[PDB]
């Protein structure tokens, strides 16, 4: 199933290097610029989006009117929300780097996150554009056997659940 996953434009915590999960930060000026550049670069298909502000705003500036689904939200970092990556405890850095065994206090485990994301994608019965987050795109790319890091305001098209089709980044 052809699905276009879009990582929302940047927020302040991207440059600051802080874990950004359910903290509802707005897009920066550049983030909005990134979202606008996506207009005309994404296919005209039904759209879905995380209900978090940065994702919804990216969808809007990109020229879409998505149906909102919390299931597309970034992972809930719990007590680690806003934590500087730099000073994150080694056990957490390792869990996030290897994308396994991540259990943040008051948040979502990576296992629960993946279940949520993949259950949502399983429900996609037709091609569509999904406005979401870096962690979601990463989970998908990793499950398809590829490195999952992509720039803010960039997109990746996949043939779920088989392979990646294309990665699109604009300057």
GROMACS .gro file of N, CA and C in nm:
model
  513
    1UNK      N    1   0.087  -0.121   0.000
    1UNK     CA    2   0.000   0.000   0.000
    1UNK      C    3   0.089   0.123   0.000
    2UNK      N    4   0.074   0.208  -0.102
    2UNK     CA    5   0.156   0.329  -0.111
    2UNK      C    6   0.116   0.432  -0.006
    3UNK      N    7   0.210   0.465   0.082
    3UNK     CA    8   0.186   0.562   0.188
    3UNK      C    9   0.300   0.662   0.193
    4UNK      N   10   0.265   0.790   0.195
    4UNK     CA   11   0.365   0.895   0.203
    4UNK      C   12   0.371   0.949   0.346
    5UNK      N   13   0.481   0.919   0.415
    5UNK     CA   14   0.499   0.966   0.551
    5UNK      C   15   0.579   1.095   0.552
    6UNK      N   16   0.523   1.198   0.615
    6UNK     CA   17   0.588   1.327   0.620
    6UNK      C   18   0.631   1.363   0.762
    7UNK      N   19   0.758   1.398   0.779
    7UNK     CA   20   0.805   1.439   0.911
    7UNK      C   21   0.777   1.589   0.919
    8UNK      N   22   0.705   1.631   1.023
    8UNK     CA   23   0.671   1.772   1.038
    8UNK      C   24   0.791   1.865   1.037
    9UNK      N   25   0.766   1.992   1.004
    9UNK     CA   26   0.872   2.090   1.002
    9UNK      C   27   0.932   2.105   1.140
   10UNK      N   28   1.051   2.166   1.147
   10UNK     CA   29   1.121   2.183   1.274
   10UNK      C   30   1.057   2.275   1.377
   11UNK      N   31   1.088   2.248   1.503
   11UNK     CA   32   1.044   2.328   1.617
   11UNK      C   33   1.175   2.366   1.685
   12UNK      N   34   1.167   2.445   1.791
   12UNK     CA   35   1.288   2.488   1.862
   12UNK      C   36   1.368   2.371   1.918
   13UNK      N   37   1.300   2.267   1.963
   13UNK     CA   38   1.371   2.154   2.022
   13UNK      C   39   1.455   2.071   1.925
   14UNK      N   40   1.443   2.097   1.795
   14UNK     CA   41   1.523   2.025   1.698
   14UNK      C   42   1.665   2.079   1.708
   15UNK      N   43   1.679   2.211   1.699
   15UNK     CA   44   1.809   2.276   1.708
   15UNK      C   45   1.866   2.262   1.849
   16UNK      N   46   1.779   2.264   1.949
   16UNK     CA   47   1.821   2.252   2.088
   16UNK      C   48   1.857   2.109   2.129
   17UNK      N   49   1.813   2.012   2.050
   17UNK     CA   50   1.844   1.873   2.081
   17UNK      C   51   1.775   1.819   2.206
   18UNK      N   52   1.645   1.846   2.218
   18UNK     CA   53   1.567   1.798   2.332
   18UNK      C   54   1.463   1.697   2.284
   19UNK      N   55   1.440   1.592   2.362
   19UNK     CA   56   1.341   1.491   2.324
   19UNK      C   57   1.204   1.558   2.314
   20UNK      N   58   1.144   1.549   2.195
   20UNK     CA   59   1.015   1.609   2.168
   20UNK      C   60   0.910   1.503   2.138
   21UNK      N   61   0.821   1.479   2.234
   21UNK     CA   62   0.717   1.379   2.216
   21UNK      C   63   0.579   1.439   2.209
   22UNK      N   64   0.506   1.434   2.321
   22UNK     CA   65   0.372   1.490   2.324
   22UNK      C   66   0.371   1.637   2.364
   23UNK      N   67   0.488   1.692   2.395
   23UNK     CA   68   0.498   1.834   2.428
   23UNK      C   69   0.451   1.903   2.300
   24UNK      N   70   0.344   1.981   2.310
   24UNK     CA   71   0.286   2.046   2.192
   24UNK      C   72   0.350   2.175   2.144
   25UNK      N   73   0.473   2.165   2.094
   25UNK     CA   74   0.544   2.282   2.044
   25UNK      C   75   0.500   2.324   1.905
   26UNK      N   76   0.507   2.455   1.877
   26UNK     CA   77   0.467   2.508   1.746
   26UNK      C   78   0.587   2.502   1.652
   27UNK      N   79   0.562   2.521   1.523
   27UNK     CA   80   0.670   2.521   1.426
   27UNK      C   81   0.747   2.652   1.437
   28UNK      N   82   0.874   2.650   1.396
   28UNK     CA   83   0.954   2.772   1.396
   28UNK      C   84   0.925   2.835   1.260
   29UNK      N   85   0.981   2.952   1.234
   29UNK     CA   86   0.960   3.019   1.107
   29UNK      C   87   1.011   2.931   0.993
   30UNK      N   88   1.129   2.872   1.014
   30UNK     CA   89   1.187   2.785   0.913
   30UNK      C   90   1.099   2.660   0.898
   31UNK      N   91   1.046   2.612   1.010
   31UNK     CA   92   0.960   2.495   1.007
   31UNK      C   93   0.839   2.518   0.918
   32UNK      N   94   0.783   2.639   0.924
   32UNK     CA   95   0.668   2.673   0.842
   32UNK      C   96   0.712   2.681   0.696
   33UNK      N   97   0.833   2.731   0.674
   33UNK     CA   98   0.886   2.743   0.538
   33UNK      C   99   0.900   2.603   0.479
   34UNK      N  100   0.949   2.510   0.560
   34UNK     CA  101   0.967   2.372   0.516
   34UNK      C  102   0.831   2.312   0.478
   35UNK      N  103   0.729   2.341   0.558
   35UNK     CA  104   0.596   2.290   0.532
   35UNK      C  105   0.541   2.343   0.400
   36UNK      N  106   0.565   2.471   0.372
   36UNK     CA  107   0.515   2.530   0.248
   36UNK      C  108   0.582   2.468   0.126
   37UNK      N  109   0.711   2.438   0.137
   37UNK     CA  110   0.783   2.378   0.026
   37UNK      C  111   0.729   2.241  -0.011
   38UNK      N  112   0.657   2.178   0.082
   38UNK     CA  113   0.600   2.046   0.057
   38UNK      C  114   0.477   2.054  -0.032
   39UNK      N  115   0.413   2.170  -0.036
   39UNK     CA  116   0.297   2.188  -0.119
   39UNK      C  117   0.337   2.177  -0.264
   40UNK      N  118   0.274   2.085  -0.337
   40UNK     CA  119   0.309   2.066  -0.477
   40UNK      C  120   0.415   1.959  -0.494
   41UNK      N  121   0.466   1.908  -0.383
   41UNK     CA  122   0.568   1.804  -0.385
   41UNK      C  123   0.509   1.671  -0.339
   42UNK      N  124   0.392   1.677  -0.278
   42UNK     CA  125   0.324   1.557  -0.229
   42UNK      C  126   0.204   1.526  -0.318
   43UNK      N  127   0.172   1.397  -0.335
   43UNK     CA  128   0.058   1.357  -0.419
   43UNK      C  129  -0.077   1.396  -0.358
   44UNK      N  130  -0.175   1.419  -0.445
   44UNK     CA  131  -0.309   1.454  -0.400
   44UNK      C  132  -0.382   1.326  -0.363
   45UNK      N  133  -0.369   1.287  -0.237
   45UNK     CA  134  -0.431   1.166  -0.184
   45UNK      C  135  -0.500   1.198  -0.053
   46UNK      N  136  -0.585   1.106  -0.003
   46UNK     CA  137  -0.651   1.134   0.125
   46UNK      C  138  -0.539   1.158   0.227
   47UNK      N  139  -0.562   1.246   0.323
   47UNK     CA  140  -0.458   1.276   0.422
   47UNK      C  141  -0.498   1.246   0.566
   48UNK      N  142  -0.399   1.203   0.644
   48UNK     CA  143  -0.419   1.172   0.785
   48UNK      C  144  -0.306   1.243   0.858
   49UNK      N  145  -0.330   1.280   0.983
   49UNK     CA  146  -0.227   1.350   1.057
   49UNK      C  147  -0.235   1.332   1.206
   50UNK      N  148  -0.118   1.343   1.269
   50UNK     CA  149  -0.107   1.338   1.413
   50UNK      C  150  -0.186   1.463   1.454
   51UNK      N  151  -0.250   1.459   1.570
   51UNK     CA  152  -0.328   1.574   1.615
   51UNK      C  153  -0.244   1.682   1.682
   52UNK      N  154  -0.114   1.656   1.698
   52UNK     CA  155  -0.025   1.754   1.761
   52UNK      C  156  -0.008   1.874   1.668
   53UNK      N  157  -0.005   1.993   1.726
   53UNK     CA  158   0.008   2.118   1.651
   53UNK      C  159   0.109   2.122   1.538
   54UNK      N  160   0.233   2.082   1.565
   54UNK     CA  161   0.337   2.086   1.462
   54UNK      C  162   0.303   2.001   1.341
   55UNK      N  163   0.237   1.888   1.363
   55UNK     CA  164   0.199   1.801   1.252
   55UNK      C  165   0.080   1.861   1.176
   56UNK      N  166  -0.024   1.901   1.249
   56UNK     CA  167  -0.142   1.960   1.187
   56UNK      C  168  -0.106   2.083   1.103
   57UNK      N  169  -0.021   2.169   1.159
   57UNK     CA  170   0.020   2.291   1.089
   57UNK      C  171   0.099   2.260   0.963
   58UNK      N  172   0.181   2.155   0.969
   58UNK     CA  173   0.259   2.115   0.853
   58UNK      C  174   0.162   2.068   0.745
   59UNK      N  175   0.062   1.990   0.785
   59UNK     CA  176  -0.038   1.939   0.692
   59UNK      C  177  -0.112   2.056   0.625
   60UNK      N  178  -0.148   2.155   0.705
   60UNK     CA  179  -0.219   2.272   0.654
   60UNK      C  180  -0.136   2.349   0.553
   61UNK      N  181  -0.016   2.389   0.593
   61UNK     CA  182   0.072   2.464   0.505
   61UNK      C  183   0.110   2.385   0.381
   62UNK      N  184   0.098   2.252   0.388
   62UNK     CA  185   0.131   2.167   0.274
   62UNK      C  186   0.012   2.154   0.180
   63UNK      N  187  -0.100   2.215   0.217
   63UNK     CA  188  -0.219   2.212   0.134
   63UNK      C  189  -0.315   2.096   0.153
   64UNK      N  190  -0.320   2.040   0.274
   64UNK     CA  191  -0.408   1.928   0.302
   64UNK      C  192  -0.507   1.957   0.416
   65UNK      N  193  -0.614   1.878   0.421
   65UNK     CA  194  -0.717   1.887   0.524
   65UNK      C  195  -0.730   1.745   0.576
   66UNK      N  196  -0.633   1.701   0.657
   66UNK     CA  197  -0.626   1.567   0.716
   66UNK      C  198  -0.725   1.532   0.825
   67UNK      N  199  -0.756   1.403   0.834
   67UNK     CA  200  -0.841   1.356   0.941
   67UNK      C  201  -0.738   1.330   1.052
   68UNK      N  202  -0.767   1.376   1.173
   68UNK     CA  203  -0.674   1.360   1.284
   68UNK      C  204  -0.683   1.228   1.358
   69UNK      N  205  -0.566   1.174   1.390
   69UNK     CA  206  -0.553   1.048   1.462
   69UNK      C  207  -0.436   1.055   1.559
   70UNK      N  208  -0.464   1.044   1.690
   70UNK     CA  209  -0.358   1.049   1.791
   70UNK      C  210  -0.262   0.932   1.772
   71UNK      N  211  -0.308   0.829   1.702
   71UNK     CA  212  -0.226   0.711   1.677
   71UNK      C  213  -0.100   0.744   1.596
   72UNK      N  214  -0.101   0.859   1.530
   72UNK     CA  215   0.014   0.902   1.450
   72UNK      C  216   0.109   0.991   1.530
   73UNK      N  217   0.082   1.008   1.659
   73UNK     CA  218   0.169   1.091   1.742
   73UNK      C  219   0.306   1.029   1.762
   74UNK      N  220   0.401   1.115   1.795
   74UNK     CA  221   0.537   1.075   1.825
   74UNK      C  222   0.525   0.990   1.952
   75UNK      N  223   0.631   0.919   1.989
   75UNK     CA  224   0.625   0.840   2.110
   75UNK      C  225   0.613   0.935   2.230
   76UNK      N  226   0.545   0.889   2.335
   76UNK     CA  227   0.529   0.969   2.457
   76UNK      C  228   0.651   0.941   2.544
   77UNK      N  229   0.740   1.040   2.554
   77UNK     CA  230   0.863   1.026   2.632
   77UNK      C  231   0.844   1.029   2.783
   78UNK      N  232   0.721   1.057   2.828
   78UNK     CA  233   0.695   1.063   2.971
   78UNK      C  234   0.784   1.162   3.042
   79UNK      N  235   0.847   1.118   3.151
   79UNK     CA  236   0.935   1.205   3.228
   79UNK      C  237   1.056   1.252   3.148
   80UNK      N  238   1.082   1.189   3.034
   80UNK     CA  239   1.195   1.229   2.951
   80UNK      C  240   1.159   1.338   2.851
   81UNK      N  241   1.033   1.381   2.851
   81UNK     CA  242   0.990   1.487   2.760
   81UNK      C  243   1.077   1.611   2.785
   82UNK      N  244   1.133   1.668   2.680
   82UNK     CA  245   1.214   1.787   2.696
   82UNK      C  246   1.357   1.764   2.743
   83UNK      N  247   1.393   1.639   2.768
   83UNK     CA  248   1.529   1.609   2.814
   83UNK      C  249   1.631   1.631   2.704
   84UNK      N  250   1.746   1.686   2.740
   84UNK     CA  251   1.853   1.708   2.644
   84UNK      C  252   1.911   1.572   2.608
   85UNK      N  253   1.918   1.542   2.479
   85UNK     CA  254   1.974   1.415   2.434
   85UNK      C  255   2.112   1.397   2.495
   86UNK      N  256   2.192   1.502   2.486
   86UNK     CA  257   2.327   1.505   2.538
   86UNK      C  258   2.343   1.444   2.677
   87UNK      N  259   2.256   1.484   2.770
   87UNK     CA  260   2.265   1.437   2.908
   87UNK      C  261   2.177   1.318   2.945
   88UNK      N  262   2.117   1.256   2.845
   88UNK     CA  263   2.031   1.141   2.869
   88UNK      C  264   2.114   1.026   2.925
   89UNK      N  265   2.059   0.955   3.023
   89UNK     CA  266   2.128   0.842   3.084
   89UNK      C  267   2.167   0.741   2.976
   90UNK      N  268   2.290   0.687   2.983
   90UNK     CA  269   2.338   0.590   2.885
   90UNK      C  270   2.240   0.479   2.848
   91UNK      N  271   2.165   0.429   2.946
   91UNK     CA  272   2.070   0.322   2.919
   91UNK      C  273   1.961   0.369   2.823
   92UNK      N  274   1.921   0.496   2.836
   92UNK     CA  275   1.819   0.551   2.748
   92UNK      C  276   1.875   0.583   2.610
   93UNK      N  277   1.995   0.640   2.605
   93UNK     CA  278   2.057   0.672   2.477
   93UNK      C  279   2.070   0.543   2.397
   94UNK      N  280   2.118   0.438   2.463
   94UNK     CA  281   2.137   0.310   2.397
   94UNK      C  282   2.004   0.252   2.349
   95UNK      N  283   1.901   0.260   2.433
   95UNK     CA  284   1.771   0.207   2.395
   95UNK      C  285   1.716   0.280   2.273
   96UNK      N  286   1.737   0.412   2.267
   96UNK     CA  287   1.689   0.490   2.154
   96UNK      C  288   1.776   0.470   2.030
   97UNK      N  289   1.906   0.455   2.050
   97UNK     CA  290   1.997   0.434   1.937
   97UNK      C  291   1.970   0.297   1.874
   98UNK      N  292   1.955   0.195   1.957
   98UNK     CA  293   1.928   0.060   1.907
   98UNK      C  294   1.778   0.036   1.887
   99UNK      N  295   1.697   0.135   1.922
   99UNK     CA  296   1.552   0.129   1.905
   99UNK      C  297   1.491   0.004   1.969
  100UNK      N  298   1.527  -0.023   2.094
  100UNK     CA  299   1.475  -0.140   2.165
  100UNK      C  300   1.486  -0.123   2.316
  101UNK      N  301   1.395  -0.187   2.389
  101UNK     CA  302   1.397  -0.182   2.535
  101UNK      C  303   1.397  -0.043   2.595
  102UNK      N  304   1.304   0.039   2.549
  102UNK     CA  305   1.290   0.176   2.596
  102UNK      C  306   1.164   0.187   2.681
  103UNK      N  307   1.183   0.211   2.811
  103UNK     CA  308   1.072   0.221   2.905
  103UNK      C  309   1.079   0.348   2.988
  104UNK      N  310   1.040   0.462   2.929
  104UNK     CA  311   1.045   0.587   3.005
  104UNK      C  312   0.936   0.596   3.112
  105UNK      N  313   0.973   0.642   3.232
  105UNK     CA  314   0.875   0.654   3.340
  105UNK      C  315   0.765   0.750   3.297
  106UNK      N  316   0.640   0.709   3.316
  106UNK     CA  317   0.527   0.793   3.279
  106UNK      C  318   0.502   0.807   3.130
  107UNK      N  319   0.573   0.729   3.049
  107UNK     CA  320   0.555   0.738   2.905
  107UNK      C  321   0.523   0.606   2.837
  108UNK      N  322   0.545   0.602   2.706
  108UNK     CA  323   0.520   0.484   2.625
  108UNK      C  324   0.647   0.405   2.599
  109UNK      N  325   0.637   0.273   2.602
  109UNK     CA  326   0.753   0.190   2.571
  109UNK      C  327   0.764   0.191   2.419
  110UNK      N  328   0.883   0.162   2.366
  110UNK     CA  329   0.899   0.159   2.221
  110UNK      C  330   0.812   0.047   2.164
  111UNK      N  331   0.797  -0.061   2.240
  111UNK     CA  332   0.715  -0.175   2.197
  111UNK      C  333   0.569  -0.133   2.182
  112UNK      N  334   0.520  -0.053   2.276
  112UNK     CA  335   0.381  -0.008   2.269
  112UNK      C  336   0.367   0.094   2.155
  113UNK      N  337   0.472   0.172   2.134
  113UNK     CA  338   0.474   0.273   2.028
  113UNK      C  339   0.465   0.205   1.892
  114UNK      N  340   0.549   0.104   1.872
  114UNK     CA  341   0.549   0.031   1.746
  114UNK      C  342   0.414  -0.035   1.723
  115UNK      N  343   0.358  -0.098   1.826
  115UNK     CA  344   0.229  -0.163   1.810
  115UNK      C  345   0.125  -0.062   1.764
  116UNK      N  346   0.125   0.055   1.825
  116UNK     CA  347   0.032   0.162   1.791
  116UNK      C  348   0.049   0.208   1.646
  117UNK      N  349   0.173   0.233   1.608
  117UNK     CA  350   0.200   0.279   1.473
  117UNK      C  351   0.165   0.174   1.368
  118UNK      N  352   0.212   0.052   1.388
  118UNK     CA  353   0.185  -0.052   1.290
  118UNK      C  354   0.039  -0.094   1.283
  119UNK      N  355  -0.032  -0.084   1.394
  119UNK     CA  356  -0.172  -0.118   1.389
  119UNK      C  357  -0.246  -0.013   1.308
  120UNK      N  358  -0.202   0.112   1.317
  120UNK     CA  359  -0.263   0.218   1.239
  120UNK      C  360  -0.237   0.198   1.090
  121UNK      N  361  -0.112   0.166   1.054
  121UNK     CA  362  -0.079   0.146   0.913
  121UNK      C  363  -0.153   0.025   0.856
  122UNK      N  364  -0.176  -0.076   0.939
  122UNK     CA  365  -0.246  -0.195   0.892
  122UNK      C  366  -0.387  -0.156   0.850
  123UNK      N  367  -0.441  -0.054   0.917
  123UNK     CA  368  -0.575  -0.008   0.887
  123UNK      C  369  -0.587   0.080   0.764
  124UNK      N  370  -0.475   0.118   0.704
  124UNK     CA  371  -0.476   0.200   0.583
  124UNK      C  372  -0.508   0.109   0.465
  125UNK      N  373  -0.630   0.120   0.415
  125UNK     CA  374  -0.674   0.036   0.304
  125UNK      C  375  -0.659   0.100   0.166
  126UNK      N  376  -0.610   0.224   0.162
  126UNK     CA  377  -0.591   0.294   0.035
  126UNK      C  378  -0.473   0.392   0.044
  127UNK      N  379  -0.411   0.425  -0.071
  127UNK     CA  380  -0.298   0.518  -0.070
  127UNK      C  381  -0.333   0.648   0.001
  128UNK      N  382  -0.237   0.703   0.074
  128UNK     CA  383  -0.261   0.825   0.149
  128UNK      C  384  -0.133   0.895   0.195
  129UNK      N  385  -0.147   1.020   0.239
  129UNK     CA  386  -0.035   1.097   0.290
  129UNK      C  387  -0.056   1.105   0.441
  130UNK      N  388   0.049   1.072   0.516
  130UNK     CA  389   0.043   1.073   0.662
  130UNK      C  390   0.138   1.177   0.720
  131UNK      N  391   0.082   1.281   0.782
  131UNK     CA  392   0.164   1.384   0.844
  131UNK      C  393   0.193   1.337   0.985
  132UNK      N  394   0.320   1.312   1.012
  132UNK     CA  395   0.357   1.257   1.140
  132UNK      C  396   0.490   1.307   1.197
  133UNK      N  397   0.558   1.221   1.272
  133UNK     CA  398   0.682   1.257   1.341
  133UNK      C  399   0.804   1.171   1.310
  134UNK      N  400   0.921   1.225   1.343
  134UNK     CA  401   1.046   1.155   1.318
  134UNK      C  402   1.051   1.014   1.374
  135UNK      N  403   0.997   0.995   1.494
  135UNK     CA  404   0.998   0.863   1.555
  135UNK      C  405   0.910   0.764   1.481
  136UNK      N  406   0.800   0.813   1.425
  136UNK     CA  407   0.708   0.727   1.351
  136UNK      C  408   0.774   0.687   1.219
  137UNK      N  409   0.831   0.785   1.149
  137UNK     CA  410   0.897   0.758   1.023
  137UNK      C  411   1.013   0.661   1.048
  138UNK      N  412   1.084   0.683   1.158
  138UNK     CA  413   1.197   0.597   1.192
  138UNK      C  414   1.153   0.453   1.218
  139UNK      N  415   1.044   0.437   1.293
  139UNK     CA  416   0.993   0.304   1.324
  139UNK      C  417   0.959   0.229   1.196
  140UNK      N  418   0.897   0.301   1.102
  140UNK     CA  419   0.857   0.242   0.974
  140UNK      C  420   0.978   0.207   0.889
  141UNK      N  421   1.070   0.302   0.873
  141UNK     CA  422   1.189   0.277   0.792
  141UNK      C  423   1.270   0.161   0.849
  142UNK      N  424   1.286   0.159   0.981
  142UNK     CA  425   1.361   0.051   1.045
  142UNK      C  426   1.295  -0.084   1.022
  143UNK      N  427   1.162  -0.088   1.030
  143UNK     CA  428   1.089  -0.213   1.009
  143UNK      C  429   1.104  -0.260   0.865
  144UNK      N  430   1.136  -0.167   0.776
  144UNK     CA  431   1.155  -0.200   0.635
  144UNK      C  432   1.304  -0.221   0.603
  145UNK      N  433   1.382  -0.240   0.709
  145UNK     CA  434   1.525  -0.266   0.695
  145UNK      C  435   1.617  -0.153   0.655
  146UNK      N  436   1.577  -0.029   0.678
  146UNK     CA  437   1.662   0.084   0.641
  146UNK      C  438   1.681   0.183   0.755
  147UNK      N  439   1.787   0.265   0.746
  147UNK     CA  440   1.811   0.366   0.848
  147UNK      C  441   1.689   0.456   0.846
  148UNK      N  442   1.634   0.488   0.963
  148UNK     CA  443   1.514   0.568   0.968
  148UNK      C  444   1.520   0.717   0.996
  149UNK      N  445   1.639   0.776   0.989
  149UNK     CA  446   1.650   0.919   1.015
  149UNK      C  447   1.625   1.002   0.889
  150UNK      N  448   1.534   1.099   0.899
  150UNK     CA  449   1.501   1.186   0.787
  150UNK      C  450   1.489   1.329   0.839
  151UNK      N  451   1.523   1.428   0.755
  151UNK     CA  452   1.517   1.570   0.792
  151UNK      C  453   1.376   1.623   0.821
  152UNK      N  454   1.365   1.726   0.906
  152UNK     CA  455   1.233   1.781   0.936
  152UNK      C  456   1.177   1.838   0.805
  153UNK      N  457   1.047   1.824   0.785
  153UNK     CA  458   0.985   1.876   0.664
  153UNK      C  459   1.019   1.794   0.540
  154UNK      N  460   1.058   1.669   0.560
  154UNK     CA  461   1.091   1.583   0.448
  154UNK      C  462   0.990   1.468   0.446
  155UNK      N  463   0.988   1.393   0.337
  155UNK     CA  464   0.893   1.284   0.326
  155UNK      C  465   0.956   1.156   0.273
  156UNK      N  466   0.886   1.046   0.296
  156UNK     CA  467   0.929   0.916   0.248
  156UNK      C  468   0.805   0.839   0.203
  157UNK      N  469   0.811   0.782   0.084
  157UNK     CA  470   0.699   0.704   0.034
  157UNK      C  471   0.739   0.558   0.050
  158UNK      N  472   0.646   0.477   0.099
  158UNK     CA  473   0.674   0.336   0.115
  158UNK      C  474   0.562   0.251   0.057
  159UNK      N  475   0.602   0.130   0.017
  159UNK     CA  476   0.502   0.028  -0.012
  159UNK      C  477   0.482  -0.061   0.111
  160UNK      N  478   0.399  -0.012   0.205
  160UNK     CA  479   0.377  -0.087   0.328
  160UNK      C  480   0.303  -0.219   0.303
  161UNK      N  481   0.349  -0.328   0.368
  161UNK     CA  482   0.461  -0.341   0.462
  161UNK      C  483   0.584  -0.406   0.400
  162UNK      N  484   0.617  -0.368   0.277
  162UNK     CA  485   0.728  -0.431   0.208
  162UNK      C  486   0.859  -0.356   0.190
  163UNK      N  487   0.852  -0.233   0.139
  163UNK     CA  488   0.974  -0.159   0.112
  163UNK      C  489   0.955  -0.010   0.102
  164UNK      N  490   1.068   0.061   0.101
  164UNK     CA  491   1.069   0.205   0.087
  164UNK      C  492   1.071   0.231  -0.063
  165UNK      N  493   0.999   0.333  -0.107
  165UNK     CA  494   0.993   0.366  -0.249
  165UNK      C  495   1.079   0.486  -0.282
  166UNK      N  496   1.068   0.591  -0.202
  166UNK     CA  497   1.148   0.709  -0.226
  166UNK      C  498   1.158   0.797  -0.102
  167UNK      N  499   1.267   0.874  -0.094
  167UNK     CA  500   1.288   0.967   0.015
  167UNK      C  501   1.299   1.103  -0.052
  168UNK      N  502   1.221   1.198  -0.003
  168UNK     CA  503   1.218   1.331  -0.061
  168UNK      C  504   1.252   1.441   0.039
  169UNK      N  505   1.360   1.513   0.011
  169UNK     CA  506   1.403   1.624   0.095
  169UNK      C  507   1.421   1.745   0.004
  170UNK      N  508   1.376   1.861   0.051
  170UNK     CA  509   1.387   1.984  -0.028
  170UNK      C  510   1.472   2.087   0.046
  171UNK      N  511   1.537   2.175  -0.029
  171UNK     CA  512   1.622   2.278   0.031
  171UNK      C  513   1.558   2.417   0.021
   0.00000   0.00000   0.00000
